[PDB]
Every structure is written in structure tokens, then in C-alpha cells.
Nucleic acid binder design. Structure first.
Lengths: 192, 143, 61, 139, 144, 72, 19, 189
RNA sequence: CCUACGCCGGCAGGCGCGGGUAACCCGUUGAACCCCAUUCGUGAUGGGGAUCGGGGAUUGCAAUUAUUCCCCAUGAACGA
């Protein structure tokens, strides 16, 4: 466990956090060619307090948000969200029927799948379980864009390899890559 | 302390709700045109002990405070605690309080707009006036 | 069960940054069952640890 | 009839002039309670409360304090009083009771009678001080 | 055993020397007693209605602690920590006119003497008075 | 939310401050301030009044920590 | 005597400084 | 004789755990008048095991940024805290301190072993000196974060948290994090 | 030009009067935090002082885009 009520509140109320999360969500939406210029249904993965999910609502999207933290969800409740919030661990799978969502988005969250604290399956197993179920719950030709924070290049390669084995194709977009203070990795994928 | 029975939970001095339970030397600061040093040098000539609060007072103390407060030269608040020293019109050493404070700020801005000076167009545009280094600032409040 | 235990040595610093000090373990139940375990932090020769259990041991080979 | 010793931390010097006296302890004309970092009074009272005031019976103890900061001066006065009593009993009384009071002081704390081995050192060029250096940027 | 001012708690001596100057009543008191701070490096007004008296007492005692200190040295003793806004704090000195005229007012009571040495020191009347009040507070110390 | 503690006394406030205070095992202006919604200025002046009441022992007395103690 | 003591102290201080 | 702060007794003090019995030095010749020692104890290894306990609670209390040389505020916070514990209990508060440090340090601890990317932890044994230091750090941290915005003086906060952890409450942040690491210890193994 | 001392300035500063071409004279280089008492009492509050309106005084050919310093009044953001 990582967040509490105090820390979830301080994160969601910080103006600097709001601005950066909003910029990365809007960049993820620009990279999401499937919702870009289209209406869509969306899954927001690691939705937190709904800072990314509010910006999906701004473009007229209907969305479901998944997060593992109660306190992040409880803080989301008071923010007048239009999305459905669900308490859920993404590493156990995506619990929707095949072909439910046009797209999926995740901002600042999937690097937690490399962490082995919460559960006693390998991160490698949970990573496979995430990508294989994520491929299934997406429509055919659906898209997934994930902004994420990798600790090293091995973590990037492992994430890419698991997405590749699950049936995704696409690549990695690295914005501002000459500043390792401000650079951001976006995983940009599509299903078959 | 004691339980003062004439305790106005709301004070109304010069068009301002004052939280009368606050300390007297820090509840007069709450209105515009009076800060901390100024209300203290008022009270040292307004002859009220600092130990009391702002709701523990008599109206005779209130009327002598407002009497000294509108007559600052006649009660030895001499001519550097004043909000305005030399006005444009009369040059009269005089304190200016909240409604007149915004009135005279508006007066000076309207004047410098009418003057067509370097300051007045800044004040109409709502920018920095004292020549600041805005190569990294100008962030919050600009659109 | 809670098992207090004597420290005999410090074999190396196992781990990825030099962070698990290596400790041969006598028991304080006077039994000569000298299991070698891993600790985190400074232990000098002649200390005494609180092994939570004696079943789960450190890695041989 | 007099012994003249000193105590030295970082910059604090504590000159001690003792002789046969009355139990008189002046620190430039003030007692050992009148020094405003007063909690450290107990450290300042460690030569008396460890040894007993009956061993400070007939000794004049003049203390003149130079330099330093307040805590450094307090440890310098503590230093100088302890070395002053020990040097007095060595020069004028036996070796045995001097050795005994030395063993009482050191086994409590060695810093009472020995000096401190370190100071605010000088600077080799390249930073604010000796150890930490200046900071830079990338990209 | 002529008692020493230095052998007393100094701030209880300051409070009693303030009460002694209050009981005296004769001194040329200035008129900016109810107006000013001590200097630029503080923010608000002092709470003491008799702050002139206790500062005069402490100034006489600082004259007792060393002779050879002028008004600029009296300015320099009463210094402090000016907060320069968001720019960092610095040491800033006392106010010249106030400390000068405190020394002038106590000079009116023949307690401050100008010398050949340029500064101002305590009178022999002054050291007699301070040792009397020192014995008063010394009896207030070793007999309370 | 708001810790706007009571600035002056009340009826029941003094009915606890004259009464409940000498039965605490520890009388601290923060504690008396904290249990009954009282500012530390108000409780601090009230505990100096409890010196003037003579009910309550004074053990420690400092700049910002002044310790009172219930009697016997 | 006092003066002498003071002088001694000063000397000591000087020595310390030198060191 | 030698008593803490002029009055407090040390010969009544008793250690429960043999596993921590030497790594707290309070009993016989490590009792001093003040926690302010001002000698080196980080000279080499394990020389901060023979420094006094209340000196450790002192020197681990200037931890935060703005307080980072102001040890005299710390020793008066220690003095007021011992007086508050001596009021609320009546016993010698050093016994409360020893019982609080003993009941607060972890017993198993998790350590990341693998590669940088294999977070597959392994709950291992806690070293006794690090149990001591982890306990002192938890007690100081509970004194910190429960005294950020309150009316309570930080001496009161330290004293009450030391009381609550000496009896093993569900109220002490130190006992909360001890139970958390002991529950994480159940998970990794 | 470093200043001491005195006088006149509620505060920045003026005026008179020496030492110092220098471990000397500033200089015992008399500092800040720290401490001991007072007030405040957990809230945008007396925290934070930004952002400005009136003045006042120096630096200089020249302060208007605030040179700097001072005195009222203004009190935003900021909840680690």
C-alpha cells in the first residue's frame, strides 16, 4: 500500500501535479488516434482521483476508471466526475467482456506493474495478465496509450515485450528526451 | 481572565465587520488603511490597555478611538504614521481609510490615465510598475 | 515461535549493494543448531538476534 | 603557592589561576550559575557534583574566558576547572589522590581532561568549504 | 564582601533597576516614548508602557560592564536581525538619536559622565547606586 | 477544519475549568486548551489564575512550557 | 594579581590562536 | 551520586529483551546529568551503541531542516517530556522510554533482492542495533507528524507518543508502522 | 575612505570633531541565531510578506520602467 487520505488529498490538491497530469493526459489523447477526432468509450487505468478522467469528459468521452487505492477513489468522489470509478488491481486483469472499449488510457500508473509488493504472482505474470486481458476487452483496432515512468531500459524492454506477446503493435514516443528531468515516455499501441 | 458581559460578537467600525473576539491591537488591522504599527500608536494615545480584547470595550472607548482615528494630528499621531502625506489636491497630512482608500487609489489611477504618463497605461493594463525582471515570472494571473 | 539467537560471525555482504550482512547463528536454547542467516544492518561478533522462526533459513548453495 | 593552567576547545580559551584560597570560583567575576546557556549548567556543574564540594575546600579558582561561542566556552570552563583542580593536587598534594580524581574524571568522560582533536578546518579551493563543492547542470 | 552587580541574575537586576528608576520619578523624559521602535530591524511596537525606563536601566548597566563605549557602541550593542523581506536576514544596528538621548537623560541625573576618553562612562554616584541596588537584589537572591 | 477555539470563558467552560482541572494527573496549558476548545493564550492566563487560586502546584515554569500539577 | 591573571589568559589565548 | 536532570533515577531501570540489552546503555555507568554530551560517537563502527539512550533521543530530534543545530530546544523538549510522563504515570519515565523502544522496533524486515526490476522481496531478520535505531526514528517521527499543526507543544506530543508506544497502543504511529512492517513480513517471507 | 566620539534628526540621514596610508585607528573586530520572561493559540490568523498607493532621505551630470534605504496603508498564492 502506498497512499492514504492525507497523501491522496495533497497530491490531488497540488496545482503543479494538476498542471502536469492535465498536460500528459492531453498529450496522450493527441497520440490516441482512435479517440482523436472520434467519439469513443474509454477505460482509464490507474485513474487515481480522476484528474486524467475529467479531461476525457472535456472531449465528450464516456469512461470507466480503475484504481487500486481507496483514498484516491474517495478523493475522486468529491470532484463531480461523470465516469464510473472502480476499486481494482490492474495486474489481476481487466474485468470487462471482449470488445467493450474503443480505447484505453493510463497516466503515470503502469510502472507499478514492475513492483512485486502487493501480490505473490511475479511482476512478469501480472504484466502478461494485464496486457492479455487488456487486448481482449478492447474492440478490434482499438488503441492504448500509457504515459509511464520506467526506472531503467530493462523495464521498458520488458513492458514492450509483454505488450508484443499479447498481440499489440505500435511503439514508444519520448517527448523532450534530452532533458531527463522533463522527458516523458508514452507507450502507443493498437490491437489487431 | 473574567467574563465581560457586554461582549459584542460583531463589531462594525467604518463599514467593516470586525471579529470582535480578536485582540484589539490586531482587529483594527483587519480594516483597510490601518495596519499593525498604526493601530498600536493609536492605542497608546487611545489609552486602552493591550491586555483586553476588542469585544471587551466600552463605546466611549470606541468613540474616542474613532475620534483620534479621524483626527490624527490633534491627538499626536504625527505626520509619518499617516496613510497619505501630501495629497495632489491639498497636500494635507491626513489618514485615509477604507472607502476613501480605494477612492484615492482610483483617483490616482484615473489621474495618471488622464495624465497619459508611463505609469498610467501600466495601471490601466494591470502590469508590473516598478521595473521588474519578468524573464521567468508573470505566471499566475496572466491570460 | 519467537526464537532469540546468538551471533557467531559476519561472512559477507550478500545482496545488490552490500546490504545483507551474513551471520552464522547459534541458538540461545543451548542447541548447537547453527543456521547461517542474513540480517539487514550492522552486527558485530557476539551479538544476539530475534529470529521470528527457525524453519525458513537463508540460502545454502 | 599558585597553579596556572588552561582549557581549549575550537576557539574558546579558559585561563585558570588557582591557589590556596577559600573555595572561591570566579568566572571573570561571576559564579557558575550566571551563564545564560543554563541547562548546560549541569555540565558546568560536573566538576562539583562528581567530586563533592568538600574536595574544593580551600582553593581560589579564577577563570578568565576568551573567544569561542557560548557552548564552546562552557566546555572550556568545565575543561579548565577539572584540569585546574588536578594540576593543583599534583603540584601541591600527593600523586595518589590526583591519580584517583583523574580516574574518577576520565572513566566518567575523557573529554573533561583531554582536548578535542578537531576544529573548523581551512579550505582547499573549489567550493564553499573544505568538503562540499559547487553545483552544476546538464542538458 | 562588597557585593558585585556581576554576581546577580542580570535580568532580575534589570527589572528591579527599572522599578528603581520608576520610583525615582525625576528625569527629563522625551516625547517620542509612545511612538518609536528600538530601530529599523524590528517590526512592531514594544508592549511596555515604560520601555524607556527599563532600556535606560539596561543602558546604565551596559555602561557599568565596560567604560569606553560611545553612542555608536551603544547603537552597536542593541542590534539585531533585520528580515529583508524574501531576501535573507542581516545584522542591523540600533537607532542613534534614541540611545543618544537616553544617555543624555541619564546624564541629567548625574549618572552618566563624559570623559576625556571620548565615550561616556558611569559616574561614581552611578557605581554607588548600582552596588546599593545590587545589594538589594543580592538580598533578594541569597535570602529569598 | 477550523480550530477556532473559544477565546473567552463561558458558563460551562468555567464550570469545567474550576472543577475538572485538579483531577488530571498532569495540568498543561496545551492539555487544558486541547480538551475543552480553548486557545493556549486563554488557558495560559487561566492557569496563571489557578496559581492565583492556590489549588494547583506549579512545578515547571519556562518561556513556553509552564507545568502545573494537581494537588495530593 | 587580577591584572597578571588577565595577562596570562591573554597569552594563553594567543598561543591557542598560533596553534 | 549521578541522577538525570538533578533528580531522575537510573538504578530502577530494567531491560526486558536480552536481544537489545547491551545496545541500550542506560543502567550503571552510562547515566549522566544531561543528554548533551558533545563528544564523538560516530567515530567508527558500533560506537553509537555505547552512547546514552536519551542522547540518542535528543540527537535524533533535531532531524528536521530548520532545527538542525538547535540542541538546546531539544533538551528542554526532553525535560518537559519526562516531566509530563512522570505526571501522567508517576513511575520513572526512563523505564517508560526503555519499554517504548523495546516494544517498537521491527522483528522481521523486507529487503529487495533480485535485480533492478525484480521486486520480489524476502522478509529477513532485523539486526538489533538497527532495531534500536528504527525504534528511535519511529518515536521521533510520531512526535514530528503529530505535532505539525496543533496547540500541543512538541514535548507533550513526544511524551504522549512515548506513553502510547510504551503500552503498545493502536494510537502510536510507531506501533502502527511496526505492525505494518511485521505484516509486510508476513507477506514477503 | 574605514571610522570612533559629541550635537541635531519619530526612521533613513546631516553638522562639528580625531586616529588610521594601516596585527596599532575602526578592534577587545562588543554579531546572528541561541537563551529567559511577555503576548499570541492552529485559522489564511498577528504565519508568508509578495502585489501597490501616498510620502521622506541619501548616491550621483542623470532615479522617470519603482537606483538604494526608510515610514504608514495593501495583505494574494502557499495547508509540505
Amino acid at each position: 500500500l502506498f497512499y492514504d487520505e492525507t497523501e491522496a488529498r495533497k497530491y490531488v490538491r497540488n496545482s503543479r501535479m494538476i498542471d502536469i497530469q492535465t498536460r500528459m493526459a492531453g498529450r496522450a489523447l493527441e497520440l490516441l488516434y482512435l479517440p482523436e477526432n472520434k467519439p469513443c468509450y474509454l477505460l482509464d487505468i490507474g485513474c487515481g482521483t480522476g484528474l486524467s478522467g475529467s479531461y476525457l469528459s472535456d472531449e465528450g468521452h464516456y469512461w470507466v476508471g480503475l484504481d487500486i487505492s481507496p483514498a484516491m477513489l474517495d478523493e475522486a468522489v468529491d470532484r463531480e466526475i461523470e465516469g464510473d470509478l472502480l476499486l481494482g488491481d490492474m495486474g489481476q486483469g481487466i474485468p470487462f467482456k471482449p470488445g467493450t472499449f474503443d480505447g484505453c488510457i493510463s497516466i503515470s500508473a503502469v510502472q507499478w506493474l514492475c513492483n512485486a509488493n502487493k501480490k505473490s504472482e511475479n511482476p512478469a505474470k501480472r504484466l502478461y495478465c494485464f496486457f492479455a486481458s487488456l487486448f481482449s476487452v478492447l474492440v478490434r483496432g482499438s488503441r492504448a496509450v500509457l504515459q509511464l515512468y520506467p526506472e531503467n531500459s530493462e523495464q521498458l524492454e520488458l513492458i514492450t515485450t509483454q505488450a508484443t506477446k499479447a498481440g499489440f503493435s505500435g511503439g514508444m514516443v519520448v517527448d523532450y528526451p534530452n532533458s531527463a528531468k522533463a522527458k516523458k515516455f508514452y507507450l502507443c499501441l493498437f490491437s489487431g | 481572565l473574567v467574563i465581560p458581559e457586554k461582549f459584542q460578537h460583531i463589531l462594525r467600525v467604518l463599514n467593516t465587520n470586525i471579529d470582535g473576539r480578536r485582540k484589539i491591537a490586531f482587529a483594527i488591522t483587519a480594516i483597510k488603511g490601518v495596519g499593525r504599527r498604526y493601530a498600536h500608536v493609536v492605542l497608546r494615545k487611545a489609552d486602552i490597555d493591550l491586555t483586553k480584547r476588542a469585544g471587551e470595550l466600552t463605546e466611549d472607548e470606541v468613540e474616542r478611538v474613532i475620534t483620534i482615528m479621524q483626527n490624527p494630528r490633534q491627538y499626536k499621531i504625527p505626520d509619518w504614521f499617516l496613510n497619505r502625506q501630501k495629497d495632489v489636491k491639498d497636500g494635507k497630512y491626513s489618514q485615509v481609510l477604507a472607502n476613501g482608500l480605494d477612492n484615492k487609489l482610483r483617483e490616482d489611477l484615473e489621474r495618471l490615465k488622464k495624465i497619459r504618463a508611463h505609469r498610467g497605461l501600466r495601471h490601466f493594463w494591470g502590469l508590473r510598475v516598478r521595473g521588474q525582471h519578468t524573464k521567468t515570472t508573470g505566471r499566475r494571473g496572466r491570460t | 515461535p519467537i526464537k532469540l539467537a546468538r551471533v557467531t560471525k559476519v561472512l559477507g555482504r550478500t545482496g545488490s549493494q552490500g546490504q545483507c550482512t551474513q551471520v552464522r547463528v547459534e541458538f540461545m536454547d543451548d542447541t548447537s543448531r547453527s543456521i547461517i542467516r542474513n540480517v539487514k544492518g550492522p552486527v558485530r561478533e557476539g551479538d544476539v538476534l530475534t529470529l521470528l522462526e527457525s524453519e525458513r533459513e537463508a540460502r545454502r548453495l | 603557592q599558585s597553579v596556572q593552567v588552561f582549557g581549549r576547545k575550537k576557539t574558546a580559551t579558559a585561563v585558570a589561576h588557582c591557589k590556596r584560597g577559600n573555595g572561591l570560583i570566579k568566572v571573570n567575576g561571576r559564579p557558575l550559575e550566571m551563564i545564560e546557556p543554563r541547562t548546560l549548567q549541569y555540565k558546568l556543574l560536573e566538576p562539583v557534583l562528581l567530586l563533592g564540594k568538600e574536595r574544593f575546600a580551600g582553593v581560589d579558582i579564577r577563570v578568565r574566558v576568551k573567544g569561542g561561542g557560548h557552548v564552546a566556552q562552557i566546555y572550556a570552563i568545565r575543561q579548565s576547572i577539572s584540569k585546574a583542580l588536578v594540576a593543583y593536587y599534583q603540584k601541591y598534594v600527593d600523586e595518589a589522590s590526583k591519580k584517583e580524581i583523574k580516574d574518577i574524571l576520565i572513566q566518567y568522560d575523557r573529554t573533561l581532561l583531554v582536548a578535542d582533536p578537531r576544529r573548523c578546518e581551512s579550505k582547499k579551493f573549489g567550493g564553499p568549504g573544505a568538503r562540499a563543492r559547487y553545483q552544476k547542470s546538464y542538458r | 564582601p562588597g557585593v558585585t552587580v556581576k554576581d546577580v541574575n542580570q535580568q532580575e537586576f534589570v527589572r528591579a533597576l527599572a522599578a528603581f528608576l520608576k520610583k525615582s520619578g525625576k528625569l527629563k523624559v522625551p516625547e517620542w516614548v509612545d511612538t518609536v521602535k528600538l530601530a529599523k530591524h524590528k517590526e512592531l511596537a514594544p508592549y511596555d508602557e515604560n520601555w524607556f525606563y527599563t532600556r535606560a536601566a539596561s543602558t546604565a548597566r551596559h555602561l557599568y560592564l565596560r567604560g569606553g563605549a560611545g553612542v555608536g557602541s551603544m547603537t552597536k550593542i542593541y542590534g539585531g536581525r533585520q528580515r529583508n523581506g524574501v531576501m535573507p536576514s542581516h545584522f542591523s544596528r540600533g537607532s542613534k538619536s534614541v540611545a543618544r538621548r537616553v544617555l543624555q537623560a541619564l546624564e541629567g541625573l548625574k549618572m552618566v559622565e563624559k570623559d576625556q576618553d571620548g565615550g561616556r562612562k558611569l559616574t561614581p554616584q552611578g557605581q554607588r547606586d548600582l552596588d546599593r541596588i545590587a545589594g538589594q537584589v543580592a538580598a533578594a537572591n541569597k535570602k529569598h | 477544519d477550523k480550530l477556532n477555539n473559544l477565546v473567552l470563558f463561558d458558563k460551562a467552560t468555567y464550570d469545567k475549568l474550576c472543577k475538572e482541572v485538579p483531577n488530571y494527573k498532569l495540568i498543561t496549558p496545551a492539555v487544558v486548551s486541547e480538551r475543552l476548545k480553548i486557545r493556549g493564550s486563554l488557558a495560559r492566563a487561566a492557569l496563571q489564575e489557578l496559581l492565583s487560586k492556590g489549588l494547583i502546584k506549579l512545578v515547571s515554569k519556562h518561556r513556553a512550557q509552564v507545568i502545573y500539577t494537581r494537588n495530593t | 594579581a587580577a591584572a597578571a591573571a588577565a595577562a596570562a589568559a591573554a597569552a594563553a589565548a594567543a598561543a591557542a590562536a598560533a596553534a | 551520586d549521578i541522577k538525570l536532570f538533578g533528580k531522575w533515577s537510573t538504578d530502577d531501570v530494567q531491560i526486558n529483551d536480552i536481544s537489545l540489552q547491551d545496545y541500550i546503555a542506560v543502567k550503571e555507568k552510562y547515566a549522566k546529568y544531561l543528554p548533551h554530551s558533545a563528544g564523538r560517537y560516530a567515530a567508527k563502527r558500533f560506537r553509537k551503541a555505547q552512547c546514552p539512550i536519551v542522547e540518542r533521543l535528543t540527537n535524533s530530534m533535531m532531524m528536521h531542516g530548520r532545527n538542525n543545530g538547535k540542541k538546546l530546544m531539544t533538551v528542554r523538549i526532553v525535560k518537559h517530556a519526562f516531566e509530563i510522563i512522570h505526571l501522567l504515570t508517576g513511575e520513572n519515565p526512563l523505564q517508560v522510554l526503555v519499554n517504548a523502544i523495546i516494544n517498537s522496533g521491527p522483528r522481521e524486515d523486507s529487503t529487495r533482492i533480485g535485480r533492478a526490476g525484480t521486486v520480489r522481496r524476502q522478509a529477513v531478520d532485523v539486526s538489533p542495533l538497527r532495531r534500536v535505531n528504527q525504534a528511535i526514528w519511529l518515536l521521533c517521527t510520531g512526535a514530528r507528524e503529530a505535532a505539525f499543526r496543533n496547540i500541543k507543544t512538541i514535548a507533550e506530543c513526544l511524551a504522549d507518543e512515548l506513553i502510547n508506544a510504551a503500552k503498545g497502543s493502536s494510537n502510536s504511529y510507531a506501533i502502527k508502522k511496526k505492525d505494518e512492517l511485521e505484516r509486510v513480513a508476513k507477506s514477503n517471507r
